[PDB]
Subunit: 145 residues, 12 copies
């Protein structure tokens, strides 16, 4: 009834385009399907977005507050280290959000440790991969029941 | 003949999207219109542009070289801390400018103190809200006349 | 035994002692029972350990390797910012761990943004209260089966 | 009426010497008159202070309190980057104020990019010559209308 | 059976769009056609792209993996200092690339020294204007064999 | 009826081991007794505790809460620069504390300047030798009124 | 032949102005009036001094030298973080001083953490208020005797 | 004269995942050859390992009263974090040499920093357990 | 038909106030007649001036533009690392200067390694004690003509 | 008076010394004779130089001033990160120069991202192996043409 | 021709040049001799080289490859902090090395804490005087078996 | 009896070489007879040295120690910012030195503000053109008779 919104940042789109071994066989779609499925099983709405354009997401988020979204679960991808606009969009709207990362952002380049969201997020999950999204949703469904 | 171009960076359109409590409550246009009125009365022809997509903001800056725009007023907001490409635009066409900010950026988080445009612009204003926008237009003019 | 060991860093024994507002009421042993139940519903063993003495924790972490623990869910608390011993213990025993925190670590003093653990954990959940422990228990159980 | 004090930092008493093509036409006098004339238009008894001395300005700020001054407009800046005594007086009397710089102060040497006032100041103006004060004073008045 | 994509980033379209000594006659398209012919002379196919938009360049390089582009010659421009997206875009597809800038990155402001791609390209060529492209292409032609 | 607690950190038990060479013949035992007598002669009860283990001090701090201690006069000594656990212990039991140091800390190494306790202590006495304990006691007694 | 000279930095003249607790009723004179009193019952003389000018306190400290002041109790206020002149003044005349701050300096802005005087004072009291002066004086009595 | 060898936390793990990560060598092994090195030089050397700082602190206070002359310490992890260990060492004022099995400089930067190094007589890192012997050979030559 | 002013910053008047050296009796007094003499012996005009008051020193150089002058030799002392008011005071009058210091700036505390006057001076001199002044003067004299 | 001088810095002699692939088989010798052959078709005279001592490179640069070398193509190697002396030399003689590196320098240790040279060069090439030099040449060879006339 | 090659950097040739307990009478020669003696005990062939010219050291490292040296014990002295060319010659010939220093570098000045050679050496010794070269040889000797 | 050694770093040999309007024709050679005549005038022995090779300079600082040079005036040039090797050369020989730079190093790139020498130098003089050497020699000259006494 009250919407959850899952936002995917740049390049998440490329997910799965070179299996066998690089996490071969997993795609941004495979992911959207589970989350959508998990959100359904506990009777809640879930919309997924994706663009390699920062202006496209800032847009979506301005719409999310308008579309009544209650809690955003964002995988800002590379934009989390560079976009304060991605931050002032999620704050300016005042929606709660939980930041999600597939990879352990802390285990990669140091410029990846900085984030423009995690501090205003309810929480942050990184490195649990796809399930990160799942748990993020788990906490979200309860967060406001 | 002349043209002033006020551009607004991301999220600025969200002005007034939840009014209580006693905050301020004004929109992106309450100023756009506050400016255009002030523009013509002094014989100069204004122009405004707003997006959350950096590309757009660049092309509008570019096309200004074709157009013959003499000076720009801009509030890149979030972009001032992040886009040099934006910087490359205003220098690429040799169109002077001014940078304005609604909130007093220096009283917020630290990261908001850096600016990729401030140093190039004729000047900067912040913490006075919309009154800076229009304080700027005032200078834009007394320069051309 | 399919042992997973839950470790709680110092001061966590005080959770729930000015009930109404500060942290509210969720006692260490309240979290312990919860984990034990989840642990048993999955037919997976789970001992727990708390101590205000860092060395008690490292002692426990070693004992865990001896005991064949497959993964540690550690809530180092104040030690995530100050303990390399803790990091090197977990890397010494090569027991993969998930770092978990109740409060959103990135929301407090900048000094709590650093972790001598995070970069080498599988992932990090923070700011999601006791559930953090549970999700961590989920990912963990599903990684062992 | 009700008083606004317009404090000037050290060096603004200088002038426009080597006046043609040094950018030194107008003097402090020419800014202090213009403004006091603008406070006349606002029906406020606006007094000014220029001192190359810190201790004269702080003392001034305390007199201002006892004299129930309502808001201070202050162009420290050779004092903006260096003094907290100035800051602690402007807070210790809790009279609101604004910061103004004739030149764009971010277009210069990197160490001008910091201020001990800007953060606890209502707003900041830099870059637009002495037009900047008139902007401050205007604003200050609407702050009393 | 080979293709070379050439990518021009933001503000590269302005070459020769300001006449006299400001980049003179040489247009982005003169560069394009010469390169096209140099390609053809040695029976290689070659395409060119340019956009002030981050997402667009991001998108088209993904199109490249689909189109079988054996190597990208790219002049990111101002996006080398901001976009970790493009870094994940080029890294994502895995199309070896060459960094080309016309001007000399290092003779400028400190933030230009920082590149999100430099450390991942085959090599960089900056400071040699148009000819920079010809060379990259020359090398790109011999690379494939 | 009121209990004041005085907690001495690691290495403080060493007071009086090389008497004339460094500091003086004064001990923890004197400071303690003179402290008790001053409190008996003021109708306050007072207990004391010293330890070289963060856990014990942490532990004691927790018991002071249950014992109804009204205030802790503490000398964390070295823990002050490294223990965010000690900090969280005092925070977790919310017993006002005054941080005392016999030696003047800022006179020493740069790292001794940082402290995880000073910003949460009611006040800090450092460098005035053992009187800083009497003064803390004295102050704590006026506070106990 | 003992005199004690108490110095009060800029703004301390403002103590006890909005007595309805922006901070309490205790005024600068009260402090001196209780200080001179305490001294006498020990047959010690004691003049005191306050000022908002860097120079005044400097000159003043210089006079203490010729006046044969045994010790100095000083509260530099903000000059503590900005004046190396006050520093070189105190080290210049070499009268040991007890740096006293009514407020726990460490609980405020980062720039207040710094101090150009602490590494050079016998000790520091900060955050214990006016009793801090008596304590300084009490310590200052017995050491001088 | 008594040397006292302190091993910080986790050193009790030496040789516990034998396949060429570490190797077969253990801490008791190191102590064994160390006490031996000591007895060969007619020096009493006591060892102490604890994953507990207070234990290590107390030990060095006891070391004062016992009359210990020099401490060879491998604070391991405690190097980059414990100024209490520093103050304890400084407090009883017993000279010490800092030891580290792996080249700390070829790892993570936070490794690079030591709260003891500047006050130790010297430092040895990257030469494996051999460092205790070197430090002990040095320790011994400072007492004889 | 020129003139030369010499400036001394705070604390200099303290020279030679604790008998044997560390400058045993080279007071500031001495250093002035010495510098004055040398100027009256090559026939140049010049006055000396020392103040523990910043504003006074700043004032004093504005009197430099009122009367004369071609070159200024200055030892700010403590105001070198602190004052940018003094810097712009020199640039504004535009009188080229020579920076001088009695002790070796570079050999003291790090904080003293920063000079606000160094990068604009004609040149700097430090560590040559008194004699340093002597050279500054000397370089000027053979520079006017 | 229309020479091009090519300068190789420290360790560049070692090209192809380990024949098997830590790099290929290419030596400085080959790069030069190719450069010289290339300068001949254009009727341009070119010289080359290499040394592992900063001073010697500083000297040869200074010597190019007197030879009337018109443009210097330089691969400074490790020196770009440490030698402000090499820097003040190319600026000393005011000979434009192109900086070339065989490997992509930004793809390694942080310190290796700094350069006391790149900013004052005409352009920089890095990563392209030997061909990086050819481009410098082909570019230089034109460069002699424009910037007339007289 | 030689199995192990010791390198002594600039200024190590100064050892013992000021003998009466401005350090030990121990020369660089004595150190070479001691090492050589020791190497003859393990039937290892050792060569020594010292110079104040980086190029001579680099050329030597190059000659070292073509000679087939197995390990380099190097005390680059000063050059540890500044030479990447030494780095590049050592890596370039791909010969492993142990780094050595006589004094505790960590006890001296901060700029001495940095090293262009430490991270690629097998190990480093410092503070144990000449004994440090011994320990390294003894270490090298064992490895070459 | 009290000899002064003047050391000029790399590139200083280029002085007086795009003559018509830049700097002067004033050569390093020229600056040297000025210092020589200044030293000779005060009864002080003065030597000079310049090399574009650091190792040549460290060597000479070492020779100065055995030469009994009471004080060194050095224009480390670009080396003041890079050679801690030069710094340790000076500290190890424990010869007091004065640092001279022709230009005002603080008015140039940020990297020119860090000196591996200055904090151990008695003093620094920069910006005063070639006369800085003169003022340094000046101090050096009176600095050889001060309170021991005498």
């Amino acid at each position: 009834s009250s919407t959850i919104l899952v936002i995917h940042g740049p390049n998440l789109n490329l997910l799965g385009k070179r299996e066998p071994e690089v996490y071969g066989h997993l795609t941004l779609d495979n992911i959207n399907r589970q989350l959508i499925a998990q959100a359904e099983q506990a009777s809640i709405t879930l919309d997924t977005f994706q663009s390699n354009w920062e202006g496209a997401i800032v847009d979506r988020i301005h719409q999310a507050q308008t579309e009544g979204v209650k809690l955003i679960i964002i995988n800002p991808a590379a934009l989390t280290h560079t976009s304060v606009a991605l931050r002032d969009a999620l704050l300016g709207v005042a929606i709660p959000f939980i930041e999600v990362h597939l990879s352990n952002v802390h285990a990669r380049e140091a410029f990846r440790h900085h984030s423009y969201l995690s501090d205003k997020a309810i929480g942050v999950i990184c490195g649990l991969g796809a399930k990160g999204y799942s748990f993020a949703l788990d906490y979200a469904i309860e967060k406001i029941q």
